[model samples]
Target chain A: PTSCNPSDMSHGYVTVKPRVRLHFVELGSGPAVCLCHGFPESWYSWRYQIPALAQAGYRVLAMDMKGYGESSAPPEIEEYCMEVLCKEMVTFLDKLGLSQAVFIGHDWGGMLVWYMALFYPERVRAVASLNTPFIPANPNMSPLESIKANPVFDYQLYFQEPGVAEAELEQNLSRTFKSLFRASDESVLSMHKVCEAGGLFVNSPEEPSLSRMVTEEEIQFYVQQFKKSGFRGPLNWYRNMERNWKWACKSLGRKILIPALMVTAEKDFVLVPQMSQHMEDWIPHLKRGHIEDCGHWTQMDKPTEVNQILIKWLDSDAR
Target chain B: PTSCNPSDMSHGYVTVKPRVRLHFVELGSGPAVCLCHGFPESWYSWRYQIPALAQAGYRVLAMDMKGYGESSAPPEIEEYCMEVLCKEMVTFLDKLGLSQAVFIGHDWGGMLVWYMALFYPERVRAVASLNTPFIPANPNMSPLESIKANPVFDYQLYFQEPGVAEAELEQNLSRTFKSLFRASDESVLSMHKVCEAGGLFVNSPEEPSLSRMVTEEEIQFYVQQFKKSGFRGPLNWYRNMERNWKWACKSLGRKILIPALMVTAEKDFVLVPQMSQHMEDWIPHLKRGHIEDCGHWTQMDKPTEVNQILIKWLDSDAR
Candidate 1:
């Protein structure tokens, strides 16, 4: 088994939406498997999975994602909403001349892929989300309101205010990236702890130990990405929490009929495994996989297990 | 037949939602007929219809509508979106102890009634709108975008900015009411004319001939109603044009299965007969009624014909 190098991958930039041009790296050519990267990272986050999936007879397209690395980042907060982002995905698929693709997402991207299945099910062959579960919109209170009212999700509240989060997160890109890409107990920042400390990077390690997750070079790659792209466009996603909820009104009482896989990380505190317990309520055809000894960064922390879970689902259920 | 007077009607206020308490006047006792008034008016706008519909053996509830006369006027713009208003209507129905009602509206109210049929079809027995058509959500441009691009709906553009519209509309209630209440050729203000004139009350007549539609006493009643409630809430409706369009996403490509009646005023330049031409595309069971020589105030301009149309529709299709 050989690793896919940056030079080995074919890169392309296409206008997914009128104002949004997305940068994606493609490898292999078989069944299409599109990867949606989470916040604070780019298509590079899926470096390991790209090669693994490609080797498994799949065409892997890992997107830089809007507002990160070579993708168009509109300044408006509403522009980053789930509704607009979902449409952009469908258009990205259209631009690629593909009708449908198996979607695999982690973190923020994980949440979006679930919405993709609900919103444009016809355009989605299958969906596999790591760390994020398919949580339906609350019929009583909106997602923002639901989050705001819950003390556990207060970090979302910090991210919601426009300039506030960007000011803190953008101040030190290296510290932000270093603090975030942790799988260890001593360093890993829980969302509630961020709120408790009164800021996202308040408890962030000034200087962190190397190894375990990624090399110093990989950390520099993320830092360089954020250096080019400010946190405003990325933080705008949190600002549109309520707007996303309002858009989800259209899909109220709607269930995902597409084949789905939810990979839960044992140490992922924010999106706990208990959250995925009742996900079968909304996604009846869902297959669940658990990656033990993993944290929030499921794919980055344990790429082999995540890749295995995805491939097994794709081969059996998703196929 | 002797008309039902204000003294004969029962007035009550019920909390429809947590922050909204709606005021309504009730008359007669039979199948419920809920009346929703347009911008710049109250339940008093339905003075004739309340009695007429009541006399024709139907229970009538003419509501002040949220943010209008006697209804809880929350000081937030987002509170005035179509989604909130539609839910308010459902809660109002619950408070009134009625499961379903035949909805009739004019102007802004007309648009709301159409949405009511779409949003809460189970709670709506039938719908009859005056001077407004049931236009489905545009797949391409939103209603606000559509209106903003078009010069004809520039009055809406003017109303969209929060304090700007309230400043102009609330400055002189008498002037505003006088200008708006006109049914004649010289006094009636066309929306585009408002835009061309740079303000809503710009082309408004000063000391115009007494309205053939509303009496001096009725004009005073409107003035008092608006005096108690500022134009902020009404203008907020215009602000939510885009928000309403976004909320309408759920019902996109969905047709109105309920029996619908659209009354178009011949001389009403803003909401012309042509706008209602293709209404049958979304409303296959639609029955349109046109009033000759009538202006924007369809129900008020020609109450007898409007009443006759309603009674006939109620007797035939709506039952």
Candidate 2:
């Protein structure tokens, strides 16, 4: 904890393209494993895993994805597409002057590791995801079609509008962070409501007096960073649905054809357990695990378990 | 709204197989337009188009596919494959004592209609897709391989895991609605995070106040139906990607000799790939229309224009 604390953070930037730059936290010294964060989250999302991963004699790189925090946010939605994300990742490897490394991700980050295998299989020795699974891309459909949670999906549509969520979230930064970084005791209420009438935030109670899932300190970290960078860049992720699907359409009939692992969450609002029904067919080399009694943020909700499973996969032949 | 209210609902159930029962909303009396949902969606996704298409003198039959709302979730995993979907669709038409009808689909529904035209052209008079496009399947690669342009392709991979999405989606039915249907603009989907965050629902904000695209009344209808049906049936659509891909490969060189209407959304990234570039190559009488500001939910997003285009086509010699 002391070695990888915020004060101990040593950040570096890489130029993926002349227009794109990314910032990341680096620690330890050994084989490299690039870690990327998901939506409404930053490198901080990997705060829990970094210490454990670093101490295990592995080089850990927890990055603030382009739009998130402590990173460059390009206004162009095209810059955020998976093809670009894969490019930056490959460039991250190139700038580091290394050929390849193990990759791990959570949420969207999890999807990134899968891309590392799909597009740059040579760069990924093994891949792992927490809460998200690897379903094949369908050229005939868009990713949004697979989502049914209306509230969350509705907000996504709103996010797609741009400036809508950014303005509302910027209007009340603390509340957005408090509402988003919620605890998971299995409350279906959190899954249904929105915060403001315009629906920029989830309708959650004010910051709780106590919460093991998200502390006041962590929530503040998100708010302060977001306050500097608006939601548009982060929201850009939602806007890339058709673009993602269209590009993924190019990969149709392809397989991961590599060692992969998916750690599912029982209470995750998306990527539900049933979604993982046919991994064996597409991902020929696969390992799976379930973190029961968990929510969308599996790493935070049950860090001990996520870390254990991650470590086991990273230490074995897959890594 | 009153005529289409919950009390006005009269759904019919049919046993397509000894163990399978499907629920459908059948209305009006004239030339038929069979509707089926794709992936995690149900027939409720067609809430807006149904009444209009029905009142316009066309019999509308929106089905809850084999593994979706009110439809049986056969314990067997193979039940969700595309071959079964095509066969069931044929059986459905036979059940209604009709040989064929115009088929309209969005998302996976759009793909289903394409498959119908591909494998069972005799059963389809005309086929339309809201935003999805038709790409010949490859025998050498998996469907997932074709969708690498966007990172969301990886989210599709997650749905292949089986049972993962069902548990999470079934956890809260109402939220699923808010998450699934939101207003769309072509560019919103270009957001990168959603393409990566286990798809869009996991990342979007929950519940917006009043939505013009998807009303509370319609959302509730979906909630009510999904509460009884669960997500397993819907997820099976994704579980069968490889099977669909393999079968689609059989139709690689065969063209859809029939008249096709691809009502493309200018913003629909999945369907807007150089379509005109290949229309002459695959479809003969391809009537194409570009809905400028629409997203994946074509009819709901640009209802007036989408309806106008659809009506013009249906009323034309194509019918």
Candidate 3:
């Protein structure tokens, strides 16, 4: 058995703070590209895209965002706000002394990339969003209050309901992780039920097969992170969704001038085609591509296609 | 407003003991045909197919099986056995003085038609099953135990679990009905969660949207019937699954000698393509026709296709 010191482990990039280290795996250095992962996923989400991007001579930088694996978990909910989160990202570029990069985000990360372009347009050369579509500020809508007839978004209500979600999640970390990652209809229905019940720990033992996607090692990793700091930091994202909406409202009518790519997963439960209906009105420079037979985790689900699209966009003269 | 006498009112067909009653709405009479309904459905389940089949030149005898609308509610669980249920069909045919007829069943009704062919082969001239496939007698398997995975089958489990499902269902009749027929993924997941949680009534208040197919009149009809008898008789059907399995095993080597047609719904969650995999082995003269874009209620979901197939089969020499 080989033993490697945790401190000596190279993340390839410099740490802005303890637990908030930026790690980069360099392939053949060319046009700089940065990848952002969604909720409940880390840099490992791009396990398929990393090699492909490197092979195409693009500098692939897939870093664990804050509150995620080995990343800093702030005690205060405000520290995890979109503004703070986006600043930490900018600090990632500043620390590396990189002027510009192609930014891509999936799920929550997709929302972040849109925020990134609005806030730091000059720093972003090109941008791509997977699964998630832009939700321009509407006075009537708040993430906590907004519910379509879809169970995928029902978890947000659980996450927003203070103390309950954290306790439930803490009681069965492994099962919670498994349910989040499970894409099957049965598992999805079970997850929706868990959220609806208001106690995630209610039916833990009975749903043994429900833990299919979350393996032992992954479960252990999540358990460690969750044990150190419960789901509060993550749940804060849901809490601050209204605040993010308020911030996004400032950029209303301001065109997304940057060359952008939007991909819709046909089988994605959370973001339906109806969700992206009026996307063209906001992003005049947007090019949309849909991948069939994929769920919320499109990059992880169809890695080669995701990587190819990213490479083609990065190399294209459109930007 | 004209007041009509109770005797003049169209009560349709009535049974004295009333195990199963056939309500024949004769339009254009030629050959006789019986329509069988699945779980959580009544004779009105074939509301779409009845008129369509009638228009196509056949006497359509749509029925409310035991424990359903305007049907007798037998107290004993054994009364709902396949043998008794199949016998009820023969008795109804005897009452009508019809020698033989084409029989069609969807969902649970589909399973009934299979049994009807075996028990009263001389009475059933031709058989067509929708969604539900023939379950051959096996020493290791029990029908009640096998049906637990299906969300639709969960009601039977609730009924078997003593007073739990009954109390819950009684408390939220509207929600229960809504849960039974709700078609969207959200409703499906919600229903699954309620069933998974071991109690249907707990989450009944939160259920949104009734099934697209079930209207106000239909729901009211179901609610009125359920209010009088509750679900004891219907629940009894599940209690006799093991008995049915044992009865089915008696005909181990027997094949369906009559012309058989199995029309599977492509989008049916309960009865998938694999459900009919071993059909050819048990049904020697089976003709399979798959209907795309339909669910467990195939006759209702795609009435035109169902009627066309039935009419074509009746016209062809295969009948």
Candidate 4:
């Protein structure tokens, strides 16, 4: 149903005709919905959900975010920051002349959706997040300090620090893609410990036995994009996390008043269940659901369930 | 149910008699069965099968092997050679006054189990492998050549190149573990490609999201062990792979007449399903089974299924 044709030059909805060359998948017609994908994943992640959303009588538009998939990858990681990312989404809305649309996201996309609700509230009619929860900015929480305290956050530190992760990741795009995309608990724990030690690289001769969920074609797509643009654009996102934090802190007291849905995956190790403990305090109108036997990639992992939930919520509110 | 307490002062069936004092969890109540754990893991890996095997009336002994968890870590990489590891296993069996025992292994353990069956068949009653398939010696299959042909095998070349993987892995044990245990498709593909590249340690500082599977306690365990011992002992495994190959080549025509079982995880990337294509030809009495929806740690991922399979196979066999 929802197909990805990389070479399909003729078909695509570029709302901002003259300015930003935004490409999007638009099908069916009803209430408007915007879907955002997460890190190490592209808009193609929503391939399973696209048809379902369309069949449910909704005009669905899922675009490849900047610096991912077929989209233009800017060299500066800062360009991939929340400010720019949020601006791009708003631009998409302005170009489409839609006053408001249902916003749904998974993983990093979830974080972006939260930002969209905060930055451009008028453009977001409703919101849904797959696994990632809104990361509140704490003035006391320094990125450096966080990296020091939690080795799990070490790559961010490396991304912020000079040329460590960039150089290492660049040398082996395929390896970086594979490892980043399919990292397991063992690898995460290993990296956490490494971060605790104040370094990011740990060389080994034998490859650890972990597998990725993406296909070879998908991986190749990421590899080619990364190789062409390098990791500076993505890594810059880490560099600008503090800037985003400062921006968020400025709007700290604001609560998400729009009807919101958060779907937590039971098997997601990164965005653990505990991360959503105080979510109600931040979101005044929140509905939560937990998906069993799923990981961080909940939308991709259980598209039917996710799509059904989103459609039901949208239809119920409409009625 | 059979159980061996690591902290217990006295146990009749098993002893912590220290040729190399390492953490161990032994189970069962009949003829001894020695279980050896592999890289990036401890004796606790056998935690799933121990109780089942023990309740089934067999003396099941599982050790952390060297270079891992509470084990006597030798500093020299050469100290982790096949001779040393094999001797340790034999000594472990000998100290308990057991002349022979069925050896079960997975990952590195799988390779060791094969070694134990081959070099010291006199000391082993049977062998069971999880995931890892034996790479019989092919004079044509040099490690360097193998790595060159497949870039994913590059880490092997790097590991053998001297001080490369060791330096990188030892930089921070926790990070090493994180990168080592990642389960994401991205991480898996990256590692697979890296392994093919013949430069394993070169791709360091992998994405944080990729390495999230390992828990804090588990990582601390590995970090402490690696900090005490460094990566030399574990790196020796890669070094010895060729040596092991050479030794196996010497007995190239000899088929493993010992009763054996090879359990392949359907979802495993490293030990592709094809690895077991001709296993029967190499292992005369091999009984093979496939575990669905499991990865390299089939025992850990699907403990119940792994235990059930092992129990049924052990019961049906006349060994």
Number of the top lDDT candidate: 1
Candidate 2, residues A55-147: lDDT per residue as tens digits? 675667788898877678888988788888888888777645456777888888888788788888988878887777777786654567754
Residue B10 lDDT, candidate 3, scale 0-100: 20
Sliding window of 10 residues with minimal summed lDDT for model 4 chain B: B7-16
TM-score for candidate 2: 0.48
Residue pairs clashing, model 3: A11-A23
Tens digits of per-residue lDDT for model 4, B1-319: 2222233211112223334454454433455677777766767667667777867756566776777755666666666677667777776655343557888898888888887887788888788888888767787676557657764455565667557677767776666676666552424335555545544445556433333444566556667756766676666677766666566677777778888898888877767778788978878888988888777666566778888887887777624
Residue-by-residue lDDT tens digits, candidate 3, B74-143: 7777888888888877766654445677888877688899999987889998998888899677777566
Candidate 1 Cα deviation (angstroms), residue A142: 3.1
The list of candidate 2 runs beyond 4 A from truth reads: A1-3, A148-152, A186-197, A200-202, A206-210, B1-319
Encode model 1's per-residue lDDT on B164-274: one tens digit a residue: 888887887777787787784745565766656778766656555667676777777788888877999888887887788778887888889999998889888878888
Number of the top TM-score candidate? 1
TM-score of chain B of 4: 0.82
Better of 2 and 4 by lDDT: 2
What TM-score does each of the candidates earn? 0.49, 0.48, 0.45, 0.45
**Distance from true position, residue A136, model 1, in Å?**
1.2
Give the Cα lDDT of each candidate: 0.79, 0.71, 0.68, 0.67
